[PDB]
Design a protein around this nucleic acid. Structure first.
Lengths: 62, 189, 138, 132, 314, 65
RNA sequence: ACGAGACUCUGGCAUGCUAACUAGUUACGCGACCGGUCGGCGUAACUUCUUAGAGGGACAAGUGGCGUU
């Protein structure tokens, strides 16, 4: 279960039942050729970094 | 001077996160001596973020209503056990502190999804601020329960709790409940 | 000789009169570093540890503090001291020294030159606290 | 939470539509001229009106505004549209004409014009979009 | 015909620069008015590091200081505020020795008599007021005066009788003489409001300007039209050269320097900042002035920084 | 404005069948110079003085006195 | 057009102004300490903290981006 970092490029929106997740696009550093969509819990920002425990998992988009 | 409390070195701080340092960082000119500048940080989103970690963590001491708003006790209780920690450990009351919090904050949580989802949840990444705030509360709750009906007093539970968190031991309530929540999330992936 | 620039914190206030003298500072007709709590002594001492003692070795400042609340009495002493030095230097000696001291303190702390806008909100009826209301019956 | 009520917007529109010459781009001057030439019963209302007037001045400089209409703008725009190219975009040396319009012109006795180049019609008959 | 090149900029203030006051008798004192409610001194060093740090800052105005003029001696300054007051600053202790209250609204531009004994002030109260150095009220021109704001009014600093020229937002200028203060000459032709007027220290030219973009030259001894010096919009500052033959007008962001002989340009001072992300118009200079030697130009902008231009020597 | 722009009057009519309540609200008009109504306008009312029509000058035309 | 907003009251700024010997700086035995803290005094400068009046001040106003610009 490797841990890697990816830079936020565009905060897509806020989702959740009562609303607690920020769906955001992150571009990997070490590749810069692949980007993914992740729903981060808690107050997140634009351009910062996020620690993912799984790179093969993506949350629902739109 | 520029050191914390005039004794804690300001120059031997380590990045130790490569790019997560922007939310855990005490290296700038704003890093003041006594962590007491009133409650103007909880007035706008992320105006708390620029606050140094020591200040927010000593702020998070006052719970349970009986000791609400007793920031003098909090700063004294942090100065004590800081003058202890490094002493018993040896590093820098700071570096140990950042390591302890980084080790005590969860990194993956479980949230419900959908308009009518009521059976399953999904794993989600945790943002720096959320984990740090939660971890500080966990550390404070562990200190409170080690000072509640126990042979240990205040300004001392924090020291050994931080030492355990830096060590990565299961003794501290913080990382043990972090592992419990992580196991719940892993079963909920 | 006298600037009487004052300084505010809650309803409490502090007035720091600055004059040409030995450089020693007095607060409430007392020396500086013996305040009874001894908890926020460095908080009010920040100007010396920031701008250096030489900048504080050419001005005699007598500070008087009046206002309800002990934590309100403090947090205005240091702002009054900084404002007193700024006003004294601007009025008497030159601009550049006050410019450097104000720039350094502001890059360190913004609150040392401007007063606090916070104040105690009124209490509206129907509840025990300011915003809180009484417990509903359901 | 800084949306302007129709009182402020309408007053600013009227002031800008009548007194364009006097006002400028600096809020601290628009407020003074507005309080000079208008009865504004409140300082805050005058500040709001002058701020929206300054915003409208920043709006007009980049182009005519939909809600703003004075004669000066009309004359300035008719000056702007007083643009004529050197060569007419219409008449050139050779213009393509299809055989059918060539027959139409020869019916009108204008089919002997030499500016006309008889181009060939479309190769096929595919001009309807597929249905479904 | 000489290129006008920036030498060393100055920053460190929290407001626009609204007036620069320069004296020809001392080569070091030069005043600055700034709508941070202050007046600033400068000590020019002419070196590469910085153009120097200001020496003294004077704070006495409840609102912005509009225009400041110096006397024949550099130890006394006269500053009018937007609050309708005037202050006589003495530099020996950094305080104001006198404050005069004759107006009720913002005094736009202030002037001084040739011998520095009269104080003539104009405000948006649609009136002009002439006092002595003691502050005793002498003359108040209200009847058959400007029907609008009086934006600027200055004396005629020549050996002849002092003569006042006042420009207003009524698109008309009016000229009077101190002997009786009676209406003699009204100048028309402007189709817009006049902001600032300046007369050369010979009583022979009088240039106005404003949003119209055209500067009108008036002869003090004649009072008739001479020629039109067209330029950019918003002529805020007009100033002649004491040691040369240059009239500089800050027509919008740019500065146009004309000659009283051929009435043609000397150098178009083009300013531009190169950036891939830029959607804001360049800052506009508000005040122009010459030094005592008349060879370096000070330009107070809306950018909270005064731009100082030397002659290229070539 | 209801403090000075509106006058309120409540009264009772006594009748054999009952009592009638009568409430009256009047709005005074903008009446300066006489104080029958308020001397100040409604705070939301902005009035603009009409532009004056004058001959736009072409050349400086002054006359000696 | 009413309601909303504006508006009235309240606070965050006034070294600009009118000012008091009820609250008070700055002012020499008197009450004293090997040049310094001390609500016991009196007129002077006439207002900075003190009270309340005229005003002024903030307007998403100035920049960066998003926006059917």
């Amino acid at each position: 279960q490797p841990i890697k970092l990816a830079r936020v490029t565009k905060v897509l929106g806020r989702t959740g039942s009562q609303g607690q997740c920020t769906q955001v696009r992150v571009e990997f550093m070490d590749d810069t050729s692949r980007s993914i969509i992740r729903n981060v819990k808690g107050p997140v920002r634009e351009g910062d970094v996020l620690t993912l425990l799984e790179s093969e998992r993506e949350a629902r988009r739109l | 001077d520029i050191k914390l409390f005039g004794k804690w070195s300001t120059d031997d701080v380590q990045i130790n996160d490569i790019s997560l340092q922007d939310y855990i960082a005490v290296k700038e000119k704003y890093a003041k001596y006594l962590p007491h500048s009133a409650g103007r940080y909880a007035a706008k989103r992320f105006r708390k973020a620029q606050c140094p970690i020591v200040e927010r963590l000593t702020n998070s001491m006052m719970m349970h209503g009986r000791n609400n708003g007793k920031k003098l006790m909090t700063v004294r209780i942090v100065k004590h056990a800081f003058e202890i920690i490094h002493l018993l450990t040896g590093e820098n009351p700071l570096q140990v502190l950042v390591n302890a919090i980084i080790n005590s904050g969860p990194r993956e949580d479980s949230t419900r999804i959908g308009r009518a989802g009521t059976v399953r949840r999904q794993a989600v990444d945790v943002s720096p601020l959320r984990r740090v705030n939660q971890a500080i509360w966990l550390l404070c709750t562990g200190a409170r329960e080690a000072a509640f009906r126990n042979i240990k007093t205040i300004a001392e539970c924090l020291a050994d709790e931080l030492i355990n968190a830096a060590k990565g031991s299961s003794n501290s309530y913080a990382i043990k409940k972090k592992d419990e929540l992580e196991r719940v999330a892993k079963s909920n992936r | 000789q006298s600037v009487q620039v004052f300084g505010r914190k809650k309803t409490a206030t502090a007035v720091a009169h600055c004059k040409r003298g030995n450089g020693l500072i007095k607060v409430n007709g007392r020396p500086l570093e013996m305040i009874e709590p001894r908890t926020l002594q460095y908080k009010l001492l920040e100007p010396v540890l920031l701008l250096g003692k030489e900048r504080f070795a050419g001005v005699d400042i007598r500070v008087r503090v009046k206002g309800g609340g002990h934590v309100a009495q403090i947090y205005a002493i240091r702002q009054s001291i900084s404002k007193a030095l700024v006003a004294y230097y601007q009025k008497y000696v030159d601009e550049a020294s006050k410019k450097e001291i104000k720039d350094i303190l502001i890059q360190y702390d913004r609150t040392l030159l401007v007063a606090d806008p916070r104040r105690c909100e009124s209490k509206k009826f129907g509840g025990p606290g300011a915003r809180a209301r009484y417990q509903k019956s359901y | 939470g800084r949306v302007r009520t129709k009182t402020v917007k309408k007053a600013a529109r009227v002031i800008i539509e009548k007194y364009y010459t006097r006002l400028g781009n600096d809020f601290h001057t628009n407020k003074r001229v507005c309080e000079e030439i208008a009865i504004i019963p409140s300082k805050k209302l005058r500040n709001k009106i002058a701020g929206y007037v300054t915003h409208l001045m920043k709006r007009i400089q980049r182009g005519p505004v939909r809600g703003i209409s004075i004669k000066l703008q009309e004359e300035e725009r008719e000056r702007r549209d007083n643009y004529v190219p050197e060569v007419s975009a219409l008449d050139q040396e050779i213009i393509e004409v299809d055989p059918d319009t060539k027959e139409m012109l020869k019916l009108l006795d204008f089919g002997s014009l030499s500016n006309l180049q008889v181009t060939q019609p479309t190769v096929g008959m595919n001009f309807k979009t597929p249905r479904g | 015909t000489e290129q006008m090149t920036l030498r060393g900029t100055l920053k460190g203030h929290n407001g626009w620069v609204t007036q620069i006051a320069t004296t020809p008798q001392f080569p070091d004192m030069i005043l600055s008015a700034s709508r941070d409610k202050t007046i600033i001194m400068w000590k020019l060093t002419r070196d590469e590091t910085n153009y120097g740090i200001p020496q003294r800052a004077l704070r006495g105005h409840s609102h912005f200081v509009s225009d400041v003029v110096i006397s024949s001696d550099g130890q006394f300054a006269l500053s009018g505020s937007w609050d309708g007051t005037l202050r006589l600053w003495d530099l020996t202790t950094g305080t104001t020795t006198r404050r005069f209250v004759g107006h009720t609204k913002d005094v736009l531009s202030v002037a001084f008599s040739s011998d520095n004994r009269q104080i003539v002030s104009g405000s948006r109260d649609k009136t002009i007021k002439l006092w002595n150095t003691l502050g005793v009220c002498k003359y108040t021109v209200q009847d058959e005066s400007h029907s609008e704001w009086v934006s600027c009014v200055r004396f005629s600093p020549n050996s002849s009788n002092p003569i006042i020229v006042s420009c207003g937002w009524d698109k008309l200028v009016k000229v009077w003489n101190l002997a009786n203060c009676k209406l003699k000459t009204n100048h028309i032709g402007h189709t817009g409001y006049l902001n600032t007027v300046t007369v050369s220290p010979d009583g022979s030219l009088c240039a106005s300007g404003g949003k119209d973009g055209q500067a009108m030259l008036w002869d003090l001894n004649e009072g008739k039209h001479l020629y039109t010096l067209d330029g950019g919009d918003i002529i805020n500052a007009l100033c002649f050269s004491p040691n040369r033959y240059w009239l500089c007008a800050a027509t919008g962001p740019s500065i146009k320097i004309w000659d009283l002989e051929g009435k043609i340009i000397v150098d178009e001072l083009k300013q531009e900042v190169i950036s891939t992300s830029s959607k804001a118009e360049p800052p506009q200079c508000t005040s122009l002035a010459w030094s005592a030697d008349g060879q370096t130009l000070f330009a107070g902008y809306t950018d909270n920084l005064v731009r100082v231009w030397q002659v290229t020597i070539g | 404005p209801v403090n000075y722009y509106v006058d309120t009057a409540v009264r009772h009519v006594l009748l054999r069948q009952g009592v009638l309540g009568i409430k009256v609200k009047i709005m005074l008009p903008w009446d300066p110079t006489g104080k029958i109504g308020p001397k100040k306008p409604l705070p939301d009312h902005v009035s603009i003085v009409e532009p004056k029509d004058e001959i736009l000058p072409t050349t400086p035309i002054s006359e000696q006195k």
